[PDB]
């Protein structure tokens, strides 16, 4: 679920999902068009694609379980949808951590009109 993803993001990065990732660049928190602005935005692009791979799942609300094996996120077995959603979120959280070094506050609340063009998954 979105809330679980947000807790995972905070655990991983020490930033609150809202507002650090909820309106960032062209893809973070609100997904659709444009060239991603930076690596963090690309994490969101890929995460959007990952959810897009699951048209008959409901990632905003469906809850999954996961645990930490010293640091590492391990998705626990739920329904097929839950497992796949968890893997998408895990990847994005790791991606955010891997790209914290280039995270830029200037991309928070990034205006829609600067995001133009479709980029294929």
């Amino acid at each position: 679920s979105l809330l679980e993803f947000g807790k995972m993001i905070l655990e991983e990065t020490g930033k609150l999902a809202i507002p650090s990732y909820s309106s960032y660049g062209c893809y973070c928190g609100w997904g659709g068009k444009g060239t991603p602005k930076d690596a963090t935005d690309r994490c969101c692009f890929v995460h959007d694609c990952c959810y897009g791979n699951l048209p008959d799942c409901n990632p905003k609300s469906d809850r999954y379980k996961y645990k930490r094996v010293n640091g590492a996120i391990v998705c626990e077995k739920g329904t097929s949808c839950e497992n796949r959603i968890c893997e998408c979120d895990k990847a994005a959280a790791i991606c955010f951590r891997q790209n914290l070094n280039t995270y830029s506050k200037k991309y928070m609340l990034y205006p829609d009109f600067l995001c133009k063009g479709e980029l294929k998954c």
């Binding site: 979105l2 947000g6 999902a17 809202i18 928190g29 609100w30 959007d48 905003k60």
Partner: peptide
């Protein structure tokens, strides 16, 4: 809350 959030939507990506």
């Amino acid at each position: 809350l959030v939507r990506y």
